[PDB]
Write a protein that binds this ligand. Structure first.
Ligand SMILES: Nc1nc2c(ncn2[C@@H]2O[C@H](COP(=O)(O)OP(=O)(O)CP(=O)(O)O)[C@@H](O)[C@H]2O)c(=O)[nH]1
Length: 260
């Protein structure tokens, strides 16, 4: 079998280190379709199956229609929405969970098969910090694996676990992110227009309320006007509201996960 894998994470997460450890010399560099940004792909074979890897440029969040130039965030937002992938590997710097897991939450809302890879666990153990990984799986609702991407042996072990999870299929558990009665009803008003898409209608409705360019652009003018009218029905700033809700959840998460 041939498996398609996307790797996504913040800059400095060790995403490139894991990618290189998995593919070695079997890598190519090109361009993303329609732009000049570098496209890095690689492959490896394991236990008779082929693994096809596409690396996404490092980003801190998905596209939210922010004038902040960020061609990379558009590319990663597009890929995370429309690029084929049997699994999205979200590489997270475990020494920096509260910030790194912000995009993790956005990815989880898409409901695409994904796993969270906590990288730099050696740095954590140097800080004498323990992460309750079962609690972390409970809060994220997706497989969570911990390693150091500079350790060849742990990377080799990661291949076996990744291969097993792809053969099993990835079991996702609903993520209890509630944005408050008012915004939830706005998501509810908008969800039917994103039914019958390749991604969660709830996710697309949220991203459209966040003004994700990749979502808004595909809409017809009347659908755009329904989205922009919903946006002004929000009594508060949508960007602040979703950030608050996401970071409030991540504060509860770290409490029950992180111990020194
Ligand atoms: N201690 C430790 N450092 C690691 C580990 N994985 C990567 N690093 C370090 O983190 C730094 C960033 O890694 P890199 O792979 O470059 O990060 P990225 O997230 O791919 C972003 P970019 O490659 O553009 O910097 C590197 O200096 C690398 O040595 C790990 O498991 N443990």
């Amino acid at each position: 079998s041939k498996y398609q894998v996307l790797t996504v994470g913040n800059p400095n997460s060790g995403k490139t280190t894991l990618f290189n450890g998995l593919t070695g010399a079997k890598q190519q560099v090109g361009n993303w379709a329609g732009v000049t940004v570098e496209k890095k792909t690689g492959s490896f074979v394991h236990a008779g199956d082929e693994f096809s890897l596409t690396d996404l440029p490092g980003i801190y969040a998905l596209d939210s229609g922010n004038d902040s130039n960020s061609i990379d965030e558009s590319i990663a937002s597009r890929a995370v929405l429309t690029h084929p992938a049997d699994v999205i590997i979200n590489v997270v710097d475990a020494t920096c969970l509260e910030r790194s897991l912000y995009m993790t939450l956005q990815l989880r809302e898409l409901r695409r098969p994904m796993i969270v890879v906590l990288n730099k666990m050696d740095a954590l153990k140097r800080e004498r910090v323990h992460l309750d990984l079962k609690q972390l799986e409970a809060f994220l609702g997706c497989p969570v694996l911990a390693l150091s991407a500079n350790n060849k042996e742990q990377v080799r072990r990661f291949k076996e676990k990744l291969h097993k999870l792809l053969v099993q299929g990835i079991a996702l558990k609903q993520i209890e992110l509630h944005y408050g009665a008012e915004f939830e009803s706005l998501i509810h008003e908008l969800e039917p227009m994103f039914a019958e898409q390749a991604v969660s209608a709830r996710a697309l409705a949220i991203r459209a309320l966040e003004n994700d360019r990749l979502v808004i652009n595909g809409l017809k003018e009347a659908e755009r006007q329904n989205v922009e009218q919903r946006q002004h029905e929000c009594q508060v700033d949508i960007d602040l509201l979703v950030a608050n809700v996401r970071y409030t959840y991540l504060h509860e998460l770290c409490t029950h996960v992180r111990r020194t």
